[PDB]
Design a protein around this ligand. Structure first.
Ligand SMILES: CC(C)(COP(=O)(O)OP(=O)(O)OC[C@H]1O[C@@H](n2cnc3c(N)ncnc32)[C@H](O)[C@@H]1OP(=O)(O)O)[C@@H](O)C(=O)NCCC(=O)NCCNC(=O)Cc1cc(O)cc(O)c1
Ligand SMILES: CC(C)(COP(=O)(O)OP(=O)(O)OC[C@H]1O[C@@H](n2cnc3c(N)ncnc32)[C@H](O)[C@@H]1OP(=O)(O)O)[C@@H](O)C(=O)NCCC(=O)NCCNC(=O)Cc1cc(O)cc(O)c1
Ligand SMILES: CC(C)(COP(=O)(O)OP(=O)(O)OC[C@H]1O[C@@H](n2cnc3c(N)ncnc32)[C@H](O)[C@@H]1OP(=O)(O)O)[C@@H](O)C(=O)NCCC(=O)NCCNC(=O)Cc1cc(O)cc(O)c1
Lengths: 421, 421, 422, 140
C-alpha cells in the first residue's frame, strides 16, 4: 500500500534534521520552518497510515484483543513494534528533560495513535475496558487496606470509616494542584475503594492546607500544576489521558474485574456512589471532577471555574459533560469565556446539590453519605449513567480529545501563559 | 460451541435440586447456598449462550424476522423451542402461585433473554416494532368504539369527545395503583385512540376516587401495586416490560400499522399528541408517564415523586428520560434520594407546563386540547421526539433494563420493603 | 433487477398520463382529484421502496463511488437525468415554479424522498454532508477581492472585515430581513469568505438598519421566511430549506471543508471560527433558529425570540433538533408546539441569550464580546463542545427525516392557506 | 392557614410550614375585613401582592417563592416536627427579647396600630351586617 514505507521515510528525514540542526531556541527561522515542515509531513502520514491500519496495528499489540493493555504499556509496545509511529521511551526521556517551550512535540504522535485506536469500534472499547481494570498498585495494597482501613499516599490520604471510603486530597503546600503522581494516587485510591467490600460509598474532599495564604483552611483543587506543565513534567498519556480513562471513568463505570465472583454475568464492574465536598474552590481539573459525582456539596464561600479560556488547554471532559449540566449557553460562558460560578448564585444548583455554611458542612456531608447506601442506588445510578453518557459518546469524544489536547499541550499560547505563572 | 449442552446440563442440575430439596423457607443454609450456586451457573450460561447465539435463536422464533411476535408470545415460543433457556408457562404458573419471597426467580432468565434480544441491532428493532403494532384486543373493539365513542374497561374509561380521546384512569379504591390488567387496558385504550380517525388529540387523567381518605377527589397515580408485587402478581414481562415497550412507547412513536392506507410510505406509524392532567399526585409509574406527554398540566396541590430510593425497583424509563428534563443533578436528587417535587415550586416547570388552581383546571385542560390539533403539531412533535430520544438510545437502555429490573424484582431489600406496605 | 425500478417507471407514467389528460389544478372534479392523488401516492411509495434497497447504488452512480463531491442542486439534477421518474427534471420544476403553491403537483416531495434516502445511508449521508461543507464557487471567486478590499456588498448581506472580525450585516431593509433563496446564497457566500479569509478571527451576524415606515431607523435581526414568496411558489425545498441547513448553518457549526492544501490539514480538515450574533428588534422563525448555533448571543432589552407558526406552519428547520438541548423538552414544546414567544428580559431568555443589554449599551457590548473569542484555546474548545452537543449521526439522522417531513409540510393544505392570507 | 389563622402568622417571630400547606384570605368578594391583615400584610408582601391576596383572594402555597414573604421555613411533613424543635432552641436568650422588641416597635408604631383599629372598629361592624356577607355566610 506504500504508507508504512512513506512514514518510515518521513520519520527518517525528521531524525536527520534533529541530529544535524542546532538545539531548539538556537535555530534560525529557515531552520525552524524546515523542521516544522518535516514534522508536519510525518504526522500527516501517521494519520493516513492509521486511518487504514489502526485495527491491524492494535491487533498485533494485544494479540487480537485478548490481552488488555493500559495506555502506558500500549504506547511503549507500539513504539518498539512500529518504529517511528510513536516515540520510544528514550526519545520521551529526552523530551521530559526539556521545558515545554523547547520540546519537539513527540507526544503529538501518541495523540495521533490514541485517536486512531479509540476511533475504532473494535479497538476503542477494548482499550477503555483495559483502563477500567484495577491497577497493580491497588491489587498489591488491597490486603493491608482491608486490614488497616488506611493508606497514606503522597497526594491522597485514604481511610475507610463507617462504610465510606474517605479520599482526602492532601497536597497542603500547593492547593491540591494536580500532577502525574496525584493521578496515580487517585486511581489507586479509587480502585481500593471499589474493591474493598467494607466500602459502600465514596467521599472526595480537599484536606487542610498549610501554605500561608490558606493556613488551616480546606481547599478542593486549584487544577493542573502549571509550574510542572511549563517545566515539561505534564504527560499527555500518563496524566491527561490516564485520568480521563482511568479513575474518572471508574467513578462513573466502576472497575472491571475478572470472572471471580457470583453475579459477574450481570455486573462485570464493581461500581459505587460518590460524594464530593468542595471547600474553598474547585478550579480546572478539580471542577471537571464534579461532573461525575452522585452528590456534590459545597461551602457557601466556594466557587467553581474552568479559567483558561484565552490560552489554556482543553478542560478534560468538561466539554463533553458540562452541557448536559448547564446547557450550551452557560457551558460556553464557563469554558469559552472563563465565567466563574459562585456557590451561592442560583446557577450553582446546576453543578452542586447542597450549599451549606462552613460550620454546618461536616454534618451535611455525613448525612449525605448515609443516603446513598443501598442496592437500589447502585442499580439506579448505573441506569442513569448509561442514559447520560453512552459508551460511544464517551469514546468518540476521547478519540478527538487525544489529538486535540496533544496539540494544545504544545501550542505557543499555552506555553507562554504557563511560563508566567 | 458446547454452550447449549452446558446450559442444558446446568438447567438439569437446577431441576434435580428443586425436585429433591425442601420448599423455599424450609431450606437450610447449606441447601440455600447450593441452589443459589446452581441458579448462578445456569444463568451465567444463559448469558454466554445468548452472547453468541441470540440472533440465530430470534431468527428461529420469528422466521428470520418476518413474523412480528410481542413479548409474551416471544418468550413462550422461546421456552418451547429452547427448553431451559427461559421458563415454560407451567414453570411460571408455579412461580405466580407463590409470594415473591418464596420464588426461585425464573423471570430473571426472561430478563437475560430479552436483554440479549434487545442488544441485537437486528432483533432489537424488530421486537420493538412488534410491540408498536396494535393489540388484537384493540382491533376487536375498534368498530364498536368508532360507533359508540365509548369503552368501559376494568382500569380505564375511554371516551371520544370533541376530537379528543379522554382516557380516565378509574381504579377508585386504590389511587390508580398499577397492575397487569391496567397495562392491558391502557395499551388497548391508547391503541383505540390512535386508530380512531375521529380522534385528533389524547388526554390522560385520573378519575374521581372512592376510598375514604380521597372520596370525591381526583387522583392521577400512586404507582405500582405494592401489595400485588409482594404477593407475586407483578410480571416482569407482562407488566414491567410490556408497559415500556407498548403503550408508553406508543405515546411517543405511535402505532405501527400495515401498509393499508395512503401516506404509509412517509408515516408507517400513526402518532398523535397527548395531554396529561395531574390531580393529587403522580407517584412512581404515574410520574414516569409524564416524561412522554406533549403537554402536562397539574393542580396547584399536586406533587411528583419516584419515592423508592432506598429499597425500590428501577422507576421504568425515568432513568433514561428524566435527565433531559431536569439535568443530572436534579435527576439524581429525585431518583437516587427520593426528592419529591411540588407543583408550585420553580423546578416543577421542568416537568409541568401549567400549574393551575383546582377550580380553574377543567377549563385549562379544555383550552390545552384545542391548541394541539393540526398537522403542524404532528410533524413538529415527530421531529422533536426523534431528536429527544434516538431509537438506539431507547433500545440500549431497555436492553440493560430488562435484566437490571429482573434482578431488582427479586432483590431481598425490595421484597422486604414491599411486604411492609 | 428485483422489479422496483420497473414498477416505479410504470407508476410515474400513469402520473404523466393523468396530468396530460385531466384538467388543470383548480378545474378538477373530486373523482379526478382523488385519482391523481392516488397516482402520486403509488409513485411516491415506490420511490421510497426503490431507494430503501438501491439508494447507495444510485448515489454511487452519480458521484463515481463517492469520489466526486456534489452539492444538493447538482445531485438532484444529475439524479433526474440518470434516473428518469425518480426525481423531477429541471423542466418539470420550472413548470412547478411558475405556479403558486396551491396549484402545484408537489414534485419537490420526490426530492424529499431522494434526500431522505441518501442522508439515511451511513456511506452516502456523510459524503453529501461533506460536499455541502465545501466552499461555494461564488465564494472562491470573490475571495481575492475580499482579502484585498475587506468588503463585499451583496443583495441581502453586507460583509466587512474590520479589526479581525467578519461583520455580516443582513440588509433587506424593506422587509425585516425576510428570507429567500438569494439570502441563503449570500449568507453561505459571506460565511465561506469569513472562514477562508486569514485576516478574520471571529464572525459577527447582525441585522441592519431598516427602511420600511413601521421600522424606519431601527435595526431588525430577522422576520423569518418570506411568506409572500412561499405562497407564490418561490421557496425551494432544496435551494432554500435544505441548502441553508446543510450549508451555511452547518458551516457556522463545523467550518468549511478544504482541500489538503495547508499545514495541519491532517488534524483540521475544516476551518472553523467562533461566531457572535446580536439581536435587535426580534428574531423570528429562521432567524431564531440561527441563534442555536452561535458561540455568543447578545440581544437588545426590547427584543423577543419566536418560532410562531405552531398551528399551520412548516417545521422550523433544525430548531426541533437543537432547541431541547438549550431549553429542555417542556419549553421547547411550548415554543414550537404552542408558539410561545420569549422576551429578552424574561429569565428564560438566558436559555438562548448570553447578554441582554439596553439599546444604548449594545454596540459597545457587542465590541467587547468580539475581543473575548480570539485565541486557539477557543477554537479547540468550541470544536470539542460542538462535537459533544451534536453528533454527526444525530445531525444526519434528523436532516434525513426532515428532508421528507418538511417537503410534505411545504405542500400541506393548512400551510398553503395560512401563507396565502399573509 | 385560612382567614383569621392566616392573619395570625403576621405576628410571629418564626413561621414554619409543611410543604403541602397554603395560606389564604379568601373572602374577597363578599367577606368581612380580615382583621389586621390589611394593616400588616403590606409590610410583608408589598402593596401588589397584598392586594392580590386580599382584594382578589389569591391563595399562596408553601412551595411557591412568594411563600417566603410569610414563611421562614418550608419542610416536608416527615421533617417538620424536628425542624419545629430546632427553631424553638434558636430563640431563647435575652438578645432575642431585646431585638424583637426593637423590631416590633419599628415595624408597627402604637399610633399606626391604634389609628387602624379605630377605623376597623366601625368598618368591620358595618361589614358584619352587610347584605352580601349575610348571603355568602348563609350558604356555607
Ligand atoms: C487558586 C488561586 C486563585 C489561589 O490564589 P492565592 O489565594 O493568591 O494563592 P497562591 O499563593 O497563588 O496559591 C498558593 C500556592 O499554591 C500554588 N498553586 C496555586 N495554584 C496552582 C496551580 N494551578 N499549579 C501549581 N501551583 C499552584 C502556588 O504555588 C502558590 O504558592 P507557592 O506554592 O508559594 O508558589 C491561584 O493560585 C490561581 O489562580 N492559580 C492558577 C489557576 C489556574 O489556571 N489553574 C489551572 C486551570 N487548568 C487546569 O486545571 C487544566 C486541566 C487539568 C486537568 O487535570 C485535565 C485537563 O484536561 C486540563
Ligand atoms: C399515595 C399515598 C402517599 C397517600 O397516602 P394515604 O392518603 O395515607 O393513603 P393510603 O390509605 O395508604 O392509600 C389509599 C388507598 O390506596 C391504596 N394504595 C395507594 N397506593 C397503593 C399502591 N401503590 N399499591 C397498593 N395499594 C395502594 C392504600 O392501600 C389504600 O387502600 P386500603 O389498603 O384498601 O385502604 C400513599 O398511599 C402511598 O404511600 N402509596 C404508595 C406510593 C409508592 O411507593 N408507589 C410505588 C412507587 N413505585 C413504583 O411506581 C414502581 C414502578 C412502577 C412502574 O409502573 C414501573 C417501574 O419500572 C417501577
Ligand atoms: C414580524 C412582524 C410580527 C412585525 O411586522 P409589523 O411590525 O406588524 O409590520 P409589517 O407591515 O407586518 O412588516 C413590515 C414589512 O416587511 C414585510 N414582511 C414582514 N415579515 C415578512 C416575511 N416573513 N416575509 C415577507 N415580507 C415580510 C411586510 O409584509 C411589510 O412589508 P410591505 O408589506 O412591503 O409593507 C410581521 O411582519 C409578521 O407577522 N411577520 C410574519 C412572521 C412569520 O410568520 N415569520 C416566518 C415564520 N416561519 C418561518 O420562518 C419558517 C422557516 C424559515 C426558515 O428559514 C427555515 C425553516 O425550515 C422554516
Amino acid at each position: 500500500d506504500g504508507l508504512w514505507a512513506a512514514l518510515t521515510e518521513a520519520a527518517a528525514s525528521v531524525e536527520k534534521l534533529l541530529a544535524t540542526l542546532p538545539e531548539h531556541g538556537a535555530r534560525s527561522s529557515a531552520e525552524r520552518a524546515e523542521i516544522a515542515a518535516a514534522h508536519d509531513a510525518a504526522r500527516a502520514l501517521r494519520v493516513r497510515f492509521l486511518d487504514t491500519h489502526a485495527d491491524a496495528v492494535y491487533d498485533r499489540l494485544t494479540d487480537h484483543r485478548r490481552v488488555h493493555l493500559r495506555l502506558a504499556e500500549l504506547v511503549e509496545a507500539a513504539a518498539t513494534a512500529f518504529p517511528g509511529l510513536v516515540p520510544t521511551q528514550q526519545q520521551l526521556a529526552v523530551e521530559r528533560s526539556l521545558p515545554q517551550a523547547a520540546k519537539e512535540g513527540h507526544e503529538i504522535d501518541q495523540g495521533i495513535f490514541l485517536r486512531a485506536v479509540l476511533r475504532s469500534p473494535l479497538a476503542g472499547p477494548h482499550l477503555l475496558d483495559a483502563m477500567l481494570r484495577p491497577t497493580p498498585r491497588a491489587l498489591e495494597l488491597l490486603p493491608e487496606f482491608v486490614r488497616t482501613g488506611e493508606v497514606e499516599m503522597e497526594a491522597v490520604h485514604l481511610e475507610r470509616r463507617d462504610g465510606v471510603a474517605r479520599l482526602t486530597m492532601c497536597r497542603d503546600d500547593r492547593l491540591n494542584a494536580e500532577d502525574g503522581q496525584q493521578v496515580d494516587d487517585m486511581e489507586t485510591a479509587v480502585d481500593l475503594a471499589l474493591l474493598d467490600p467494607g466500602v459502600r460509598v465514596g467521599l472526595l474532599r480537599g484536606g487542610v492546607m498549610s501554605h500561608p495564604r490558606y493556613r488551616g483552611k480546606r481547599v478542593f483543587s486549584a487544577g493542573i500544576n502549571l509550574k510542572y506543565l511549563s517545566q515539561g513534567g505534564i504527560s499527555l498519556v500518563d496524566f491527561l489521558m490516564r485520568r480521563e480513562l482511568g479513575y474518572i471513568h471508574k467513578l462513573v463505570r466502576g472497575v472491571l474485574t475478572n470472572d471471580d465472583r457470583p453475579g459477574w454475568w450481570h455486573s462485570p464492574r464493581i461500581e459505587k456512589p460518590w460524594v464530593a465536598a468542595v471547600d474553598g474552590f474547585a478550579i480546572g481539573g478539580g471542577a471537571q471532577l464534579l461532573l461525575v459525582f452522585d452528590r456534590v456539596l459545597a461551602s457557601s464561600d466556594a466557587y467553581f471555574s474552568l479559567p483558561a479560556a484565552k490560552e489554556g488547554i482543553i478542560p478534560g471532559a468538561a466539554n463533553l459533560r458540562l452541557g448536559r449540566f448547564a446547557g450550551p449557553r452557560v457551558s460556553r460562558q464557563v469554558i469559552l469565556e472563563g465565567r466563574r460560578i459562585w456557590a451561592k448564585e442560583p446557577e450553582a444548583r446546576l453543578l452542586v446539590d447542597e450549599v451549606v455554611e462552613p460550620d454546618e458542612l461536616d454534618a451535611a456531608i455525613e448525612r449525605s453519605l448515609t443516603r446513598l447506601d443501598g442496592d437500589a442506588v447502585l442499580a439506579n445510578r448505573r441506569m442513569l449513567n448509561l442514559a447520560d453518557e453512552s459508551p460511544d459518546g464517551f469514546r468518540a469524544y476521547m478519540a478527538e480529545f487525544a489529538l486535540m489536547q496533544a496539540l494544545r499541550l504544545y501550542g505557543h499560547d499555552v506555553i507562554d501563559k504557563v511560563g508566567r505563572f
